[model samples]
Target: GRGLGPLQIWQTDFTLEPRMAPRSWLAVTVDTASSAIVVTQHGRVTSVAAQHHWATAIAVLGRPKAIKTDNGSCFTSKSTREWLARWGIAHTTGIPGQAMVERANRLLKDKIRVLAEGDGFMKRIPTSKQGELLAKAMYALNH
Candidate 1:
């Protein structure tokens, strides 16, 4: 915010994963470019886990000047705060054009919705499709 570009602005959020996330929720990192660079369905959506996702995004997309998110405990804890400070990334929780992140969340889920229409592995997400399936969908949307 204040004075940052789309490239420097990255947002992260979680969506109820239709398949594996029946237990563990799925989290995603979306850049201002409207592209999801990281998506993981992990049991614990802790700050360390989130920071891992953010790290993945940073590795490829480079460091973000700021990130927008919600008040969910997964991303609003001391560890998360410390990680942001360490990374030099300013976080804006709630209010600050978060609809874009929401849109990204919807876009990913919508894509997965279609992916689930198939049979067998696609319908239930088998071991092979565990991460690959989502990666395939992400590639389609992003590239």
Candidate 2:
């Protein structure tokens, strides 16, 4: 049987209280087909933050056909819906009880925390500096 064609799925979720700061959240969007990260952003846990990350990914990846995200306020917000509508991206809120994306979110959080702790730089830093760290971490992930 032929598999799904050009299957592109975007999965996203947030992490709280990571080593870098208290009450910090990281939003990541991943391409299910290639397992490639499309975009990531760090901020307080809020729908706007999530939207920002989604917008970033859409701008970079050209609006994926489908996106899967946990049923958080951030993911279910009207703002998010509007953005998806504008891009014509189909959104799939993960099954209410499913653990797949939750597991992935936890793994990403753990990896990021471990890296920050090992490098002895867990305190919140400037956004630009954090971006540099994130870039390095993403490189490691891709390799």
Candidate 3:
């Protein structure tokens, strides 16, 4: 089953060393109902980074009833939990396995991989090119 509606459940995770960009992280949030990416931000895999991603997602899609993230410290830290509580969003940690969100994460990586290949760039994506490529890649997925 899926979420009741868009923004009902937001699944977020940080892709550390994504295939295209080995040096950076992709902080992504996907809307469960529509399978549309709410936000795709590039940053470190830290609590603050995750918070910033959530802030952007909230600005764009509003708050979801609950947020699903892995049991990583970035999402489970005391401060992180407090931050979610401040927004009145419920936090749920799922087991490490293939789920809708994880699939979405892989799809993004695959899309980026193709985009990088099309750009004639192999190996790790440069920082200068990460933002542009990530934006283009996610747009292709959402459209």
Return the number of clashes found in candidate 1. 0
Where does candidate 3 stray beyond 4 Å? 1-7, 18-23, 39-43, 94-98
In order of lDDT, best first, we have 3, 1, 2
lDDT of 1 by residue, 1-143 (tens): 43453456887887777476543466778777646557777676677778887887788777878898888887889999999999999998855467767877778777776776554445556655567777766786789
Question: After TM-score superposition, what is the CA distance of residue 129 in candidate 1 from its true location, in Å?
Answer: 1.6
Give stretches of model 1 more than 4 Å off: 1-7, 22-24, 34-36, 119-123
Task: Report residue 92 deviation for candidate 3 (angstroms).
Answer: 1.1
| Weakest ten-residue segment in model 2 by summed lDDT | 15-24
Q: lDDT for each of the candidates?
A: 0.74, 0.67, 0.79
lDDT of 3: 0.79
Each candidate's number of clashing pairs is 0, 0, 0
Candidate 2 lDDT at 30 equals 72
Candidate 3 lDDT over 1-143, as tens digits, reads: 33454458888988865554544687888888678785455546789889988998899777789988889899999989999999999998965432777877788888888898888777677778877888888798888
- Tens-place lDDT digits, model 2, residues 1-143: 21766576777767664454432566777777566564365547777787788888778666677888777887788988887788798988845533445655665666666667666766654444566566666666556
Question: Roughly what TM-score does model 2 have, to 2 decimal places?
Answer: 0.76
